[PDB]
Each structure stands twice: as structure tokens, then as C-alpha cells.
Amino acid sequence: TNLKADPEELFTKLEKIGKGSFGEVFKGIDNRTQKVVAIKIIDLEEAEDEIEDIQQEITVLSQCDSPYVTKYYGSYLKDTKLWIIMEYLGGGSALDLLEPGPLDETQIATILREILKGLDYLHSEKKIHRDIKAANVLLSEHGEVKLADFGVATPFWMAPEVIKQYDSKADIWSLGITAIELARGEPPHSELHPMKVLFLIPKNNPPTLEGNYSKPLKEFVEACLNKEPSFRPTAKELLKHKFILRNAKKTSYLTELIDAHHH
Ligand SMILES: CNc1ncc2cc(-c3ccc(-c4cccc(C)n4)cc3Cl)c(=O)n(C[C@H]3OC[C@H](N)CO3)c2n1
């Protein structure tokens, strides 16, 4: 977290690539290497109790060294603005890639498998992602799949025990919801007011995947979406799930999904 270096000099800020947590995010250029980066700019005068959450997310990202976690390159403070520099992933989010139409089960399994590799990494490091969902899964222009936007230490992807106040198995529930989101376009209860969903997730039976999907995909979802966390499999075990093994293919095939999105 460098305090003398000037980030206007080190980076060229390009177009906004969305609003993230706590500030605007820009495509940018590292002027020394010409590599494309993602730049989040947070106004610290506009942040109340958020500054502690920002620092905690920086710390966690700095401790991750995995091809399945968006890389953190550093941060800078210029007058009142914190610049956070991260790996730029040109494929967009998995949520973005749902827009042209439905994924097939090969694409779903490939994305889930790469998410599981990230979760296996994090849980083996004694970390919890805490916000697994399609919008937080970023793809490189080559089809590599990475996790982003860790949750701080909207309810639709939250495990019931998280809502009732848990461990890494909460990520497995969120993965199940993400599986449904990748199959259907949106999570269970997405039509409902969030405050309704807050009491439905604890109260109701767990969601199931409805529609003409393979039984292994439906069983993948069911295994993740058990109200009892100890009954959920680990990420390691789910990497061997028949749905994953029978359907996932090379990640480079996902470039066809990325091109379809830039139709
Ligand atoms: C479309 N390619 C693409 N490539 C790469 C990144 C990277 C980040 C990123 C993540 C997290 C943070 C970060 C790190 C520590 C603390 C705090 C408070 N934020 C900083 C950035 Cl720079 C991003 O915001 N986006 C955009 C986003 O929009 C929201 C969506 N949920 C995920 O992607 C990216 N987008």
C-alpha cells in the first residue's frame, strides 16, 4: 500500500467496467508494462465504517496466490482516493455470459469445476469466499475462470446458517445456488422482495433445480443445497462429482461463450 507513488503517473485510467464494492472500477493500463489492469478508486472521505472492510479485503487478496483467484497487484493513496490495482479479466463475469441465452451443461460443469478449484484453494488455506455467485466469477479472454469480490467477514446466495449466524460449507451452499443461477439465469426466489427471502431461506426446504436438466446436474445442486452443512460435500469431493466428471471440458472452450457474448 504505497503512499509516495502517484497512481496517475503509473496507470492510465480507461473506461469504467462497472461499479464494484465501495467505488467505481475502471479498465486501466500499467504504463510500465502496458498490461491491462482493473482499477478500483475509492473515495475515503466518502467511506465511513467501510474503511476497515476495504483493508480486510486487501489483506485477504494479498495472501492469495492461485490461478483461480483474481490477482492483487497493490494499492495507492492519492489525496483522498484509494486506488486498488488488480488483474484485468477480459471475458467478463459468468453472469454477463448468461445474457445471450442459456448455457449448456458442458459450459455449466466447466465453470463449476473451475469455481471448485478456487474454493478448494481457499478452503485449504482456511479462507472462506463468502460471496460465491455468477457475478463474482470472472473469466479471462482465454476462458480461465477466477473468483473475485470476496464477501465481508443481498440474500439470494446466502446459506441458511449464515442468515441465522458457520464455515467453508457456506461456500458450498452458495455454489449450489450458483449452479442453479448458471442453469436458469437467476437464483431461487429472485422475483421476491429481499426481506421476504431473508426468512424463506431458513424456513423453507432447500431449493432444487427445476426443468429439463440432467439428473447428475440436479444431484450436484441437491448435494450442495442441504440445510445441514455437515451433509454438504467438500469442494475436493465435488470435483469428483459425476456431473463434473462427465460434463466438464477444457476451459479454452469457454472462449466460444465469450465471443457469443460479444456477438
Ligand atoms: C470485467 N473484468 C474485470 N476484471 C477484473 C476486475 C477486478 C475487480 C476488483 C475486485 C475487487 C477489488 C477490491 C480489492 C480489495 C478491496 C476492495 C474494496 N476491492 C478491486 C477490483 Cl479492481 C472489479 O471490480 N472488476 C469489476 C467487477 O464488477 C463487479 C463484479 N461483481 C465483478 O467484477 C473486475 N472486472
Q: Report whether 73 contacts 37 (CB < 8 A).
A: yes
* Exposed / middle / buried, residue 112 (Cβ in 10 Å: 0-12, 13-18, 19+): buried
- According to DSSP, residue 83 is labeled E
Helix residue ranges per DSSP H, 137-234: 160-164, 169-184, 194-203, 215-224
Q: Is the CB of 178 under 6 A from ligand 1?
A: no
Residue minimizing CA distance to atom 7 of ligand 1: 38
From 96, 131, 167, 171, the catalytic residue: 131
Write the CB contacts of 66 (distance below 8 Å, at least 6 apart in sequence). 118, 121, 122
Q: Report whether 132 contacts 119 (CB < 8 A).
A: yes
Q: Report whether 214 contacts 104 (CB < 8 A).
A: no
Q: How far apart are CA 23 and CA 213, in angstroms?
A: 38
Q: How close is the Cα of 208 to the center of ligand 1, in Å? A: 30
Q: How close is the Cα of 25 to the center of ligand 1, in Å? A: 7
Q: How far apart are CA 57 and CA 23, in angstroms?
A: 14
Write the CB contacts of 195 (distance below 8 Å, at least 6 apart in sequence). none
Q: How far apart are CA 168 and CA 128, in angstroms?
A: 5
**Vertex 127 angle, CA 75 and 177, to 5°:** 105
161 is in an annotated binding site: no
Q: What is the resolution of this structure in A?
A: 2.1
Q: How was this structure determined?
A: X-ray
Catalytic, 65? Answer: no
Q: How far apart are CA 131 and CA 96, in angstroms?
A: 17
- Percent of the chain that is helix, strand, coil (3-state, to 5): 40, 20, 40
Q: Report whether 239 contacts 68 (CB < 8 A).
A: no
Q: Report whether 125 contacts 62 (CB < 8 A).
A: no
Q: Write out the H or E segment, with its range, that includes residue 261.
A: helix 255-261
Q: Report whether 185 contacts 178 (CB < 8 A).
A: no
Cell of 27: 479498465
Number of residues assigned to the chain = 263
* Exposed / middle / buried, residue 58 (Cβ in 10 Å: 0-12, 13-18, 19+): middle
Query: Among 246, 238, 180, 175, which Cα is nearest to 213's?
Result: 180
Distances from the Cα of 257 to the Cα of 68, 145, 263, angstroms: 19, 12, 10
Q: Is the CB of 57 under 6 A from ligand 1?
A: yes
Q: How far apart are CA 211 and CA 183, in angstroms?
A: 9
Centre a 10 Å sphere on the Cβ of residue 121 and count the other Cβ atoms it contains: 19
